[PDB]
Amino acid sequence: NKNIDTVREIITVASILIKFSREDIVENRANFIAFLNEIGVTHEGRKLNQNSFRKIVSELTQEDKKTLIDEFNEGFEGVYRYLEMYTNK
Amino acid sequence: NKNIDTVREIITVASILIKFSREDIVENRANFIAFLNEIGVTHEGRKLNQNSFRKIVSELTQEDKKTLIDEFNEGFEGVYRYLEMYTNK
């Protein structure tokens, strides 16, 4: 629906790669975007574009992030340092 | 939010698993539920249970399934064969 929904399922997904200890895929946004289209993570039901990716992950409000922090306590903490930093453009 | 939302992020995560050729996890609902508790797919802001898992996948409407067909073109073709057959109880 909005931005969080998509970040949400890419949080789980990239924590798979963290679970398997393949943080290298996570370590670059573009490689990861490609990876996104490949395994089929969509935004608003559409394919996920390079610019429109960066706006989803980065431009979130504090609210959206608190909502992730509340539901994905330990999970988002770690992987959201990773996801944030690797798309510090 | 609703059942579809749940299946949605769990879909992409299991296409990760078949990307890595780890269909052993996908091949049974229970192993998958365990893995759901691992990576942290939380449904209605709550922990995902064995019975509550089977509802999310099963009770979907034809419209909900068609919704995933339309939004997750490539992915739900593949993984939703797999996902559906392995939880025909």
Side-chain angles (χ1 to χ4, degrees):
Chain A
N1 279 286
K2 40 205 284 293
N3 305 326
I4 190 180
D5 288 280
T6 300
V7 160
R8 175 183 290 166
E9 62 193 61
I10 314 159
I11 272 156
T12 51
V13 160
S15 80
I16 307 279
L17 280 41
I18 300 182
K19 144 161 271 69
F20 301 140
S21 211
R22 305 299 297 253
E23 28 54 78
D24 289 346
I25 297 194
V26 192
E27 196 226 12
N28 195 266
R29 44 159 187 78
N31 302 123
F32 188 88
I33 292 154
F35 161 77
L36 307 196
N37 292 274
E38 171 74 49
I39 91 294
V41 187
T42 62
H43 186 31
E44 303 173 341
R46 301 222 77 233
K47 290 270 171 52
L48 228 170
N49 295 341
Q50 192 167 93
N51 59 348
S52 309
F53 184 65
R54 228 177 86 226
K55 87 189 270 293
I56 58 170
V57 301
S58 299
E59 83 164 280
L60 292 176
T61 68
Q62 299 295 344
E63 313 89 55
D64 303 301
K65 292 185 287 171
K66 301 276 89 165
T67 299
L68 292 161
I69 297 162
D70 272 2
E71 292 183 354
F72 286 86
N73 297 265
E74 179 180 308
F76 155 116
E77 200 186 306
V79 308
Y80 191 64
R81 316 302 192 153
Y82 283 60
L83 292 161
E84 206 193 27
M85 93 180 76
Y86 302 143
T87 158
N88 291 169
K89 223 280 187 173
Chain B
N1 271 263
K2 50 256 292 296
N3 297 297
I4 193 175
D5 289 275
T6 334
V7 209
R8 189 208 295 127
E9 64 199 60
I10 311 165
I11 278 156
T12 43
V13 169
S15 66
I16 308 280
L17 296 202
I18 301 182
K19 128 164 262 55
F20 301 137
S21 206
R22 304 301 297 204
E23 26 71 283
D24 286 7
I25 289 174
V26 194
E27 185 193 6
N28 191 280
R29 33 168 182 82
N31 310 131
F32 196 82
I33 293 157
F35 166 80
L36 309 200
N37 282 262
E38 287 292 297
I39 90 294
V41 184
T42 32
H43 181 29
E44 290 165 9
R46 292 182 58 186
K47 292 294 193 72
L48 221 162
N49 301 291
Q50 196 119 324
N51 59 10
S52 311
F53 181 68
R54 238 183 78 258
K55 88 167 281 280
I56 52 173
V57 310
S58 310
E59 80 162 2
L60 303 174
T61 67
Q62 313 308 306
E63 292 68 66
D64 296 297
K65 294 184 290 190
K66 178 56 59 175
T67 299
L68 295 169
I69 298 168
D70 278 358
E71 298 197 296
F72 287 83
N73 296 272
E74 182 189 355
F76 169 109
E77 203 184 288
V79 270
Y80 189 76
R81 301 308 192 84
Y82 285 65
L83 295 169
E84 186 171 56
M85 84 184 73
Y86 301 145
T87 169
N88 290 161
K89 227 291 203 185

